[PDB]
Scaffold this active site. Structure first.
Site, PDB file in Angstrom:
ATOM      1  N   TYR A 103       0.840  -1.180   0.000  1.00  0.00           N
ATOM      2  CA  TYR A 103       0.000   0.000   0.000  1.00  0.00           C
ATOM      3  C   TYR A 103       0.877   1.233   0.000  1.00  0.00           C
ATOM      4  O   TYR A 103       0.358   2.306  -0.324  1.00  0.00           O
ATOM      5  CB  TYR A 103      -0.945   0.069   1.188  1.00  0.00           C
ATOM      6  CG  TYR A 103      -2.151  -0.828   1.130  1.00  0.00           C
ATOM      7  CD1 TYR A 103      -3.062  -0.688   0.111  1.00  0.00           C
ATOM      8  CD2 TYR A 103      -2.384  -1.803   2.080  1.00  0.00           C
ATOM      9  CE1 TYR A 103      -4.175  -1.459   0.040  1.00  0.00           C
ATOM     10  CE2 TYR A 103      -3.513  -2.590   2.029  1.00  0.00           C
ATOM     11  CZ  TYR A 103      -4.399  -2.418   1.004  1.00  0.00           C
ATOM     12  OH  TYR A 103      -5.504  -3.228   0.965  1.00  0.00           O
ATOM     13  N   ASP A 165      -3.076 -11.134   8.854  1.00  0.00           N
ATOM     14  CA  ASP A 165      -2.184 -12.153   8.328  1.00  0.00           C
ATOM     15  C   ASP A 165      -0.785 -12.014   8.842  1.00  0.00           C
ATOM     16  O   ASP A 165      -0.088 -13.014   8.910  1.00  0.00           O
ATOM     17  CB  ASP A 165      -2.079 -12.149   6.798  1.00  0.00           C
ATOM     18  CG  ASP A 165      -3.301 -12.740   6.108  1.00  0.00           C
ATOM     19  OD1 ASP A 165      -4.056 -13.479   6.786  1.00  0.00           O
ATOM     20  OD2 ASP A 165      -3.479 -12.487   4.885  1.00  0.00           O
ATOM     21  N   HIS A 417       4.641  -6.766  -2.830  1.00  0.00           N
ATOM     22  CA  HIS A 417       3.221  -6.848  -2.969  1.00  0.00           C
ATOM     23  C   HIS A 417       2.483  -5.600  -3.299  1.00  0.00           C
ATOM     24  O   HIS A 417       2.898  -4.468  -3.001  1.00  0.00           O
ATOM     25  CB  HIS A 417       2.513  -7.811  -2.083  1.00  0.00           C
ATOM     26  CG  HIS A 417       2.566  -7.422  -0.653  1.00  0.00           C
ATOM     27  ND1 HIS A 417       3.672  -6.811  -0.117  1.00  0.00           N
ATOM     28  CD2 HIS A 417       1.719  -7.650   0.374  1.00  0.00           C
ATOM     29  CE1 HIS A 417       3.478  -6.624   1.176  1.00  0.00           C
ATOM     30  NE2 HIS A 417       2.304  -7.132   1.502  1.00  0.00           N
ATOM     31  N   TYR A 498     -11.575  -0.534  -1.008  1.00  0.00           N
ATOM     32  CA  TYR A 498     -11.836  -0.088   0.365  1.00  0.00           C
ATOM     33  C   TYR A 498     -10.659   0.637   1.087  1.00  0.00           C
ATOM     34  O   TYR A 498     -10.820   1.411   2.069  1.00  0.00           O
ATOM     35  CB  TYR A 498     -12.264  -1.318   1.199  1.00  0.00           C
ATOM     36  CG  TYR A 498     -11.183  -1.982   2.074  1.00  0.00           C
ATOM     37  CD1 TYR A 498     -10.156  -2.778   1.576  1.00  0.00           C
ATOM     38  CD2 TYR A 498     -11.207  -1.752   3.451  1.00  0.00           C
ATOM     39  CE1 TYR A 498      -9.222  -3.332   2.424  1.00  0.00           C
ATOM     40  CE2 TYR A 498     -10.297  -2.293   4.286  1.00  0.00           C
ATOM     41  CZ  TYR A 498      -9.291  -3.079   3.777  1.00  0.00           C
ATOM     42  OH  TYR A 498      -8.392  -3.575   4.706  1.00  0.00           O
ATOM     43  N   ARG A 499      -9.469   0.350   0.557  1.00  0.00           N
ATOM     44  CA  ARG A 499      -8.193   0.862   1.046  1.00  0.00           C
ATOM     45  C   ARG A 499      -7.247   0.656  -0.152  1.00  0.00           C
ATOM     46  O   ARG A 499      -7.564  -0.203  -0.947  1.00  0.00           O
ATOM     47  CB  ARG A 499      -7.798  -0.050   2.207  1.00  0.00           C
ATOM     48  CG  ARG A 499      -6.472   0.311   2.890  1.00  0.00           C
ATOM     49  CD  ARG A 499      -6.309  -0.656   4.010  1.00  0.00           C
ATOM     50  NE  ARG A 499      -5.042  -0.560   4.703  1.00  0.00           N
ATOM     51  CZ  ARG A 499      -4.635  -1.524   5.523  1.00  0.00           C
ATOM     52  NH1 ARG A 499      -5.425  -2.578   5.684  1.00  0.00           N
ATOM     53  NH2 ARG A 499      -3.472  -1.481   6.171  1.00  0.00           N
TER      54      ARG A 499
END
Ligand SMILES: *Cc1cc2c(cc1C)nc1c(=O)[nH]c(=O)nc-1n2C[C@H](O)[C@H](O)[C@H](O)COP(=O)(O)OP(=O)(O)OC[C@H]1O[C@@H](n2cnc3c(N)ncnc32)[C@H](O)[C@@H]1O
Ligand SMILES: *Cc1cc2c(cc1C)nc1c(=O)[nH]c(=O)nc-1n2C[C@H](O)[C@H](O)[C@H](O)COP(=O)(O)OP(=O)(O)OC[C@H]1O[C@@H](n2cnc3c(N)ncnc32)[C@H](O)[C@@H]1O
Ligand SMILES: *Cc1cc2c(cc1C)nc1c(=O)[nH]c(=O)nc-1n2C[C@H](O)[C@H](O)[C@H](O)COP(=O)(O)OP(=O)(O)OC[C@H]1O[C@@H](n2cnc3c(N)ncnc32)[C@H](O)[C@@H]1O
Ligand SMILES: C/C=C/c1ccc(O)c(OC)c1
Ligand SMILES: C/C=C/c1ccc(O)c(OC)c1
Ligand SMILES: C/C=C/c1ccc(O)c(OC)c1
Lengths: 555, 555, 555
Positions: A103, A165, A417, A498-499
């Site tokens: 992110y 996680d 990621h 959502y994010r």
């Protein structure tokens, strides 16, 4: 020091220097790190997160990035700093721990911004209340940290976490991001009650009952406001009285967080974790129509996960260790995989909670339900290979932190990621229909689709797991491309993320366009009112202080 | 017309007249009622609520009160009106249904304000989604209304409500007030997802996913924004992306509500309602220590109610029909009462939900638990007199609307209600300690304490039920007195009121004083930013636009 | 009068009344028409255009619409009116003739706006200069009007027009819209030189050399500025000196036009019009690769048109008179059609200009070129049926006005036009590729694709001709839907619309988004600087004065 690689806007260098000087002058030379050179190129490790930028970088490495790092030692520091950040229009970029990987991580939307490493100093568990079942923490209380606390206080027998996680994220950063975990207490943001925040103007605030002041007493007299204890109900009742503002504080630049009350989940006296494996890729569809009423029925308890084989597979091994092929793996190769593994194509993880009489029926209920799906297959950890992810998720679904997940971040060589996180109804159809697209695109992008669905109650969090090799440009560009493409489609079909990552905040806020950006407009309005100077991390959630051009800024 | 009894501030009369003229010119003469004279003295009935003021009036009848009533026929009307209200600095006072009795009802904090009777026109059930389990409504959808809809659509078999003690309130007004109901879906505000609001500047907004626009299609083209359908997830996922602002919309003057998505509770296939009666006044204490872990344990399901005998008693009869005595009844008289009734001093109502295998253990669990309390006694509706409140609460705990409650509003002759609603922990002690005070004061005030506790999850809503005879001044003054006194103590001991009457908003917002009113300050800031003109119901929750003096305004 | 159906923003009614009163007080009761009732429902005829709204209405009839009509009698009137429009923040919506059908017609983007019917009074041909070859006109000089003038002055032998498919449009409105015609002088806007405009603040301006003042002389002394003659070069050299601003005046709300110099095309002494028919739908492709270099080579002279059979066909008859079928006609039905007609599937109209020695080679050049296309077929008017469109276009390509075109507006019963006008390269491929889409969509929308390509020099104007029955809602919605869909695709593939309807201005300006709306942003900036009050037709080209909300306004 003297010369950071990037200055924030209109900041002159002597100005940068003064700021940085008054600043070291508060927090200690210890609390500061300037970013003088590309000897910064250093992305790090989960164990020791870099603050200067985005490790999982899709953009040029240096694309989003610090001017300097600052570790406030205590609330007043934050306060002081804001003041200065205010004096100079220097901008902020607060973070708790930085594991916001996939992110952006530590990386600030606006480069040349200062990194407010809160958590470094601000490491405390302020309280853990058994009677109330809750804890109160700082930005620096990582989960594990949160765990070991209860541990070294024998609390686990009385109380339980709800992890995501991975184990090292900030309990606090995670809650603000509206991160999600897997026990029934998985909806993190929602489990909050009473937070404190340093507003944009330096003034402190305590939301909700945080506001009904603890009555006075000798014992507590003379303590700084950031130091005074909380009212009784503060942390047991999120709403308070009057406006319920807490929300301006999640995925927004309204204020800087310093503390927060998270409710704890009381040990349930009974815990059964399991896994029903789904055989066909098309299973996912019936699978959902299935979970739909169980979730709404509460037969389903925590937030259950529906996994794509590769997530499990990749946790088990890199991509190469299953195919020495560059392209996306064939759909037949997954099937070999499901098998090499005992897995499903799709794989549903969940857990049972309570006295056994309790779990038994539930489980008779689910098991019996998943039955209509052929080749369906059920299981306890016990029933499985010692590296099996069902093994990991059992701890997981009981608040126990682990770090087994990242391994999957490893599919690719300079695996990094990136998360595409569109919401999707709990309808097999919709689930299918959304999946198709995302996939379809991962193919075109030349990628292994990999992703899950966090089983929401009337919704579902579709986490597309895009990895890619950070040191491969042809690829990075494909992801970016894939990224923004998927963003449009989903939206085109009616689904919002959502994010998201630093680099797509704008794009997505743009999805949120009903009535001509009204939502965005409203936000700006309040943002400016409260942060006239645009000091507090501008551009987050795609919102910008007047002072920032859309044109100069957006993406 | 021409001459309302009270003009809002600085409003000249011709100005009032023009406003009122352009206004009739929009909504129809039909949609407007001016308030020309004291022939207004008319307080009404629950069946036909007055909008002009507070029926349950503690203050002089005319103390808080309309200049005129306005019934917007549709969103654009609201929009237009705001514009005018904006042109003229006329102020607003929106309401849905007006049953906000015991808190003010229709009555506007600022007199001379216009009453925006939304619900009158804006009566629609926009949608009821089974798959998603939710409904979408307007201000005018009263609960019963909501009920009969499902009814006349055979839905009850698929879906269920969550009502408050009375049936006629606005499903919507109630949710904004953070009203509470008794099924597990009792936390109303929290069951919302996607709302639309006309902001202070006339512009529309749709919170959360309300913002991810439904994709286009022939079928939907050209409809006004207030008329377009919603995105898929709109109503199944309250957070959206970026700031979670919805909360600025509850118990605040941030915007005018026009619609809202409330989630529905799927029929559970199994429903057992009951009642354990508590014998000793001191029972309340052990009683709570008891419920404490069951609530946190989820053994307890919906929000259970702990009643004080008189509430039940009073539902059964006025005060006079049990004692022809002016003063508070002796503590021995209650005891006669508990008995004349089969009731407890205290009385705990709850309900079981699910397949029987499910309820059975729960109930074995509770029943067995309440056992340590002597003379404890359990019961099904069946086991009780046909006017028994357990009779009423069964429907109640299953979403069925009733109107049996008000009867209690009748203890006194010109019975009127006033609610003192301090929050209290779920600790018998605290529960006790808070009760003592409130009582103690009801005595001094010359009153029958009467009240309950809504069994929150880590909290509890202490509803003190003050009735009094509205036509008795000596008394009204005692209540006011009692009111503000209890407000100080509670606070003095650390307890805040969660919602309150028009006349005490200020007093209580003042309780919320940590760090020098910071919370209040913050609110104002955003209020002004967004409602520069102070048009939209100023003073609510005790918040006021700059334009309003504290001194001229507060209380 | 007193009560128009729609008020512009924040306009109170007495205010509307005063404005309207001072206004009748200038221009005469004669010059004004209020719009008091739906007895307005009256859409009209090309012969007598309605000003109140959009006749070819895709939206609700009343959707975009006047508050009142105002016919300035002379420049000062406009000036006065602006002043008032300025006093009251009343907004403007100037138009010349109103034949802007298929784009909105008379209809104002903002309803409640005043319609400035310029042309009604302002009908004059100010001058027609032979030596300079140009004319100077007012908003009211319709083409035919322009024609008959030269006619009744025997000028046609010396000079020539350049008409658009229809004869009645404003020579002036057309030039501002960047309308296009078919002689080599077809690029209308570009043929302008010296214009006068009443700016937003009431002050006059004369672009270019319009600014180098005619020197003084007895004869000219004392005439109002709007009345003084022009400098020599005014109208023979568009640039003047310093900024070339004229462009702020086309498809913008920068100012109100009052006059303009259009250059005239000198009779060429030789005129051959023709038509090569194209047999295969796929012909269009080779056809273009063909025209490509001839256009750039100037072998091709005027702007030639490539027609889709149905345009011709529809000029010849309604849809019904060829198929009593609701749906889109089969591709085989066109082929029957091409034939019933002698037409091509595609049909290329052009014209030769000059001394014969001149035309001959050109024509040997084209004819020889179109040869590679099989079944290709060439023709002179002469060689064709007396209703043949080649018949109409001959006049057309020589500046002669006609009204035969509208007939096509008649395909459908309550035929109305709507134009999708994406630009497209001059590449058969691109031409094809763009066509596919548009069609594809017309099918899905349930429509007859119908459209052409104005043969630009390095570009091409793709006019999709959407008709539909204005009295059919299911349909209207499909068009809207089709509209905005085609808009996205085209853009998605890289093609912008060059001009559009009132209802899509926003959508398309949004296409123009490079660097975060920078172009739009820039526009606003200058718009406000010059039209602080937003009085002059706000929302055109999708640009809005601050005063207008995006949210309240956009589409
Ligand atoms: C790689 C990965 C990531 C991941 C995941 C699995 C893998 C393999 N599983 C996740 C899951 O199940 N649920 C979830 O929510 N996230 C998951 N992720 C993503 C990520 O690892 C975690 O969410 C992680 O908890 C987020 O990072 P961290 O907790 O370390 O937070 P941070 O980097 O400090 O940033 C939080 C952001 O929010 C704002 N913020 C943070 N602190 C403050 C303070 N004190 N004040 C104000 N705002 C604050 C900032 O915007 C910051 O960027
Ligand atoms: C007398 C009584 C009251 C009562 C109760 C039992 C008795 C005997 N039991 C209640 C219960 O169990 N739970 C509860 O929450 N309330 C209970 N009450 C109080 C009251 O009767 C109900 O809460 C009732 O639902 C409230 O009134 P109503 O629903 O009719 O709402 P309203 O008068 O229209 O006002 C709502 C307030 O919120 C704001 N509001 C309302 N509508 C809007 C819109 N459209 N836009 C913006 N704000 C709005 C206003 O401030 C209004 O005052
Ligand atoms: C139905 C149709 C339309 C059409 C066409 C064929 C058919 C069958 N063929 C056209 C063609 O070959 N070329 C072309 O450019 N347009 C064609 N159309 C569309 C239309 O009929 C014509 O373009 C027509 O000339 C446009 O209408 P008109 O000329 O009557 O102009 P108007 O309605 O008054 O509006 C002009 C717009 O520009 C601005 N404007 C106009 N006057 C002023 C003044 N004085 N000051 C400032 N701005 C002005 C306004 O925005 C107005 O809306
Ligand atoms: C997979 C990991 C993950 C990433 C982002 C999230 O938001 C999340 O929770 C829904 C989980
Ligand atoms: C007793 C009725 C009541 C009044 C006010 C409330 O807020 C409430 O819910 C907690 C219930
Ligand atoms: C066909 C008629 C037409 C409509 C709009 C235009 O802009 C145009 O010129 C390119 C022609």
């Amino acid at each position: 020091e003297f010369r950071p690689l990037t200055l924030p806007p209109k900041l002159s260098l002597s100005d940068f220097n003064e700021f940085i000087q008054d600043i070291i002058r508060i927090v200690g030379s210890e609390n500061v790190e300037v970013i003088s050179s590309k000897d910064q190129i250093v992305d790090g490790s989960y164990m020791k997160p870099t603050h200067t930028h985005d490790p999982h970088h899709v953009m040029d490495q240096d694309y989003f990035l610090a001017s300097a790092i600052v570790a406030p030692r205590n609330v007043a520091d934050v306060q002081s700093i804001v003041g200065l950040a205010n004096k100079f229009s220097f901008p902020l970029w607060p973070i708790s721990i930085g594991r916001n990987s996939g992110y952006g991580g530590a990386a600030p939307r606006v480069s040349g911004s200062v990194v407010l490493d809160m958590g470094k100093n601000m490491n405390r568990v302020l309280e853990v209340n058994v009677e109330g079942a809750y804890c109160v923490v700082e930005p620096g209380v990582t989960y594990h940290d949160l765990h070991n606390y209860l541990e070294a206080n024998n609390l686990r027998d009385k109380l339980w976490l709800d992890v995501p996680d991975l184990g090292g994220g900030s309990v606090l950063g995670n809650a603000v991001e509206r991160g999600v975990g897997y026990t029934p207490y998985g909806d993190h943001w929602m489990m909050h009650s009473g937070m404190e925040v340093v507003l944009a103007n330096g003034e402190l605030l305590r939301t909700g009952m945080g506001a009904l002041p603890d009555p006075k007493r000798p014992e507590t007299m003379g303590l700084k406001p950031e130091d005074q204890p909380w009212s009784k109900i503060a942390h047991l009742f999120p709403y308070g009285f009057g406006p319920y503002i807490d929300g301006l504080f999640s995925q927004s630049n309204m204020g800087i967080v310093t503390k927060i009350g998270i409710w704890l989940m009381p040990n349930p006296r009974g815990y059964q974790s399991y896994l029903i494996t789904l055989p066909k890729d098309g299973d996912l569809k019936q699978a959902v129509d299935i979970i739909r009423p169980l979730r709404l029925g509460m037969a389903l308890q925590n937030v259950p996960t529906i996994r794509h084989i590769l997530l499990d597979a990749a946790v088990l091994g890199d991509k190469r260790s299953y195919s020495s092929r560059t392209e996306p793996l064939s759909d037949e190769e997954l099937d070999k995989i499901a098998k090499q593994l005992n897995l499903g194509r799709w794989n549903f993880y969940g857990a049972l909670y309570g006295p056994e009489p309790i779990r038994r029926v539930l489980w008779e209920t689910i098991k019996d339900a998943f039955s209509a799906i052929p080749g369906v297959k059920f299981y306890f950890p016990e029933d499985t290979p010692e590296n099996s992810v069902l093994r990991v998720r059992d701890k997981t679904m009981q608040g126990i932190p682990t770090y087994d997940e990242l391994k999957w971040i490893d599919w690719l060589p300079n695996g990094a990621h990136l998360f595409f996180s569109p919401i999707a109804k709990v309808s097999g159809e919709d689930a299918m229909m959304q999946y198709a697209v995302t996939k379809k695109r991962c193919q075109e992008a030349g990628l292994d689709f990999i992703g899950t669905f966090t089983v929401g109650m009337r919704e579902m969090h579709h986490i597309v797991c895009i990895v890619f090799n950070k040191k491969d440009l042809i690829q990075k560009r494909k992801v970016q491309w894939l990224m923004r493409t998927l963003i449009d489609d989903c939206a085109a079909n009616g689904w919002g993320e959502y994010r998201t990552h630093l680099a797509f905040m704008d794009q997505i806020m743009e999805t949120y366009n009903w009535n001509n950006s009204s939502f965005l407009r409203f936000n700006e309005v309040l943002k400016n009112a409260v942060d006239p100077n645009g000091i507090i991390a501008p551009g987050k959630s795609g919102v910008w202080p007047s002072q920032y051009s859309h044109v100069t800024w957006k993406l």
